[PDB]
């Protein structure tokens, strides 16, 4: 099991309170109590940021819920505070999640006086953590499976949301890690991995070989498309392209392997052999191009066991004609997976610190 996850973007500390407190004492002549509490709620928000984006990596629902709360909050402050009028005086500075920058200098960083920029990088890190937690799961466990599937789908919908909104909200030119191309590709990757998780669920629940094959076939479409978005690009870490190329072939081999079990059941012995030969070729390709990144050895043995047994009996008993691949029906596609929409609130039991404002 080799899953892709995304590193969180780094940020630097900001005093959210100082510039927010000072811009609350406006309309609101109440230099007394009520108005001067909405200014300690802005202390809670500044502390919340330090919590969401400042603490050393924690990989629990603990740390993700913090992040998602922080995102929820930032979004409900945008009507409260003048920022695409701006107006207020906050600068958020974030490093690019991927571009190391030249060691002939420093990071690739981008400072902007924008709530838009802030929420985008926050959402990014919500997606990235979600992907880390999904990739962490023990997939030999039904609840591990379920947490991976839920989180890959969240991460997919949240990268996609950034794709539709980064440019609108930034005004300026985004950094390449959050730009629509990188992030549309990360969305498709998480969604591929979500599908792969359903394939593994079905494997585990020993479902109908026909079901499993369509689930694997659709995964191969998703992984196919993601590697093709990466073919001419060097934005993501270097392990990403070869993993996606490998998975695209592994997924196709799983499709053919399970479709072969169905053919056999149906006494279509020639078709079984044809599909198994396709599987073995795919898996032979991956074993020789991509061995630094996946271990395909037990699958390969399993295919070779089935193909050796298949050929021996067809030659000695059935004499079925082994058909050509272009003459076989296509394996269908079952998609069980979508990009979770970002609809605030995204956090568990949210309350806006500035609700009655």
């Amino acid at each position: 099991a080799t899953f892709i996850s995304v590193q969180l973007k780094k940020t630097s500390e900001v005093d959210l309170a100082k510039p927010l407190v000072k811009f609350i004492q406006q309309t609101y002549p109440s230099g007394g109590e009520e108005q001067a509490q909405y200014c300690r709620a802005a202390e809670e928000l500044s502390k919340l940021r330090r919590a969401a984006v400042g603490r050393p990596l924690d990989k629990h629902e603990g740390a993700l819920e913090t992040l998602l709360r922080y995102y929820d909050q930032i979004c409900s402050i945008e009507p409260k505070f003048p920022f695409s009028e701006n107006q207020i005086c906050l600068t958020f500075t974030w490093k690019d999640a991927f571009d190391k920058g030249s060691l002939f200098g420093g990071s690739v960083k981008l400072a902007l006086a924008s709530l838009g920029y802030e929420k985008s990088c926050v959402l990014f890190n919500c997606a990235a953590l979600a992907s880390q937690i999904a990739a962490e799961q023990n997939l030999d466990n039904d609840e591990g499976l379920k947490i991976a599937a839920k989180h890959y789908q969240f991460a997919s919908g949240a990268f996609l949301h950034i794709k539709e909104t980064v440019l609108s909200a930034l005004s300026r030119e985004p950094t390449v890690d959050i730009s629509p191309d990188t992030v549309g590709t990360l969305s498709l990757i998480m969604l591929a991995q979500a599908q792969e998780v359903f394939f593994l669920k079905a494997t585990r629940d020993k479902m109908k070989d026909a079901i499993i094959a369509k689930l694997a076939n659709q995964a191969a479409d998703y992984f196919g498309d993601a590697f093709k978005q990466c073919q001419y690009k060097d934005t993501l870490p270097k392990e990403v392209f070869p993993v996606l190329a490998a998975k695209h072939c592994i997924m196709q081999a799983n499709a053919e392997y399970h479709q072969s079990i169905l053919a056999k059941q149906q006494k279509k012995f020639g078709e079984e052999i044809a599909r198994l030969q396709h599987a073995a070729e795919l898996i032979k390709t991956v074993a020789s191009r991509y061995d630094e990144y996946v271990n395909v050895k037990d699958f390969s043995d399993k295919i070779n066991r089935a193909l050796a047994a298949a050929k021996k009996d067809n030659d000695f008993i059935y004499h079925d004609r082994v058909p050509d691949l272009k003459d076989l029906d296509p394996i269908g596609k079952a998609t069980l997976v979508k990009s979770t929409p970002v609809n605030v609130p995204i956090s568990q039991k949210f309350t806006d610190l500035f609700e009655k404002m």
């Binding site: 599937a149 079905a202 069980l336």
Partner: peptide, 13 residues
Amino acid sequence: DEEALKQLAEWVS
């Protein structure tokens, strides 16, 4: 065959 498919869709729910 989309019967066992709904009973997969509604697991992650």
